[PDB]
Amino acid sequence: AKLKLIKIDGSFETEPVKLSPGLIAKELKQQPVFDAVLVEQASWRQGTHSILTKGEVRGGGKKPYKQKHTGKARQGSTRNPHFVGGGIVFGPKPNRNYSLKLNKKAHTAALHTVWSEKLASDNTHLVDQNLFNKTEGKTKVMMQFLKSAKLLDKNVLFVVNTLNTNLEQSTSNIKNVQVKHLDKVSVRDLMLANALLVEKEVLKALEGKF
Template sequence: MAASSVASTLLLSLSSSSSPFLSPTSVSFLPSAAAAASSSPRVAVAAGKQKAAVSVLRALRAEAATLPVLSFTGEKVGEVALDLKSAPPSTARAVVHRAIITDRQNKRRGTASTLTRGEVRGGGRKPYQQKKTGKARRGSMRTPLRPGGGVIFGPKPRDWSIKINRKEKRLAISTALASAAVADDAFVVEEFDEEFAAGPKTRDFVAALQRWGLDPKEKAMFFATDFADNVRLSGRNIGSLKMLTPRTLNLYDILDARKLFFTPAAINYLNSRYGATVFDEYEDDTNGEDDGEEEAEELQEGEGSAEEAAQVY
């Protein structure tokens, strides 16, 4: 299935929920036409120059959601707040769509290859004489018009990867998580490592999912900072369950799951990484430079300092 069709299906299912982040309503963050006309030309020019720098800051906003905390037996024992940055409704679908297309397309290996007419082996001799056969004339067996010949405009190895800024990708993940939280599709479970201390057992894990109100046949995502060995072994045989850690957290599994549940430690991690204080760095870096380019510059600076040190010694 193509990446665009997968993304369209996921976004359509997400937009049909009660989430306010991916709703079709549009919200304008720009001044009205009357206000723009009343301002002086000098002010308009200055505003135009600063528009690109502060547009991201105006777009981001924090939305807090209260998630119920359930015990291993399925009883509600408290609540916890999930306060994540999210894109406004007018741009949320575009941000999430761009991130999911990037993830899916960057996973393509790009190794498909076919032989052209010049790469097919053989075909140097004329198959049969030009005339007196009653057949169409043939000059080579490598022609694309015959079986075993070359392929016209066939696929060749290529790089399908596309670029996306790290901050934009993080914003898409936080927007998807906040959307699920507001739509009441997420909850928190207490740590239950001790329940599987005797050994892994998938039957007990499935029973716990049912007590939490989850259908084992529906797709779900379980996010935790770390999994105990017995817990990981108990849940890995459930085909509809994705057990993710901060290292494997991705946008596709978030959108593909019907329900999301976390551990208290995972909520603290999400609030610290995707929360209100994370995107404050936009105030210091509003030029939109990619983090990958920054890392490349730091690497070049490190190589330069190493060469200088070698010259000194």
């Protein structure tokens, strides 16, 4: 599945660039990607959810009740999970973390498989340093390029390895673009985007880890 380079206008060129073997996998596995997105998607908590249990609520314990010569229960405590005193034995804690961990070899297999799938999904046209230059700070030209090839199906995630002022100025005021670095990646991002752009150089760099 050789991929042809594309220009900033949307027209292709005469060089269909060969795909590095550092992304194509042998067998497709759905469990490593599943638990990788499981661990990555979580941990949105900021310790926000916190409640006071019966031992954490404020109050002076006393017994206004007398068991004999009364109709209600004894209930020598007033801050109960079922009275108006409050305090539930079960609730959210600011210390729960739900520890999860991913190995090295399984992570490598999952990343290689997802690189094979995303490179062969054919939702990408290769870019080069030449179109990186002569780039205005306007996001309007970026939108012109995007709609020239009309990538209006899914959000597009570019992967970059070198920083340019045009890149930081542009690609920042559009609802349908996102940019990340070669090693600043996570399978959750790839499967969420379902559309991406890749530069020529990073293929050989990623070939190393395979």
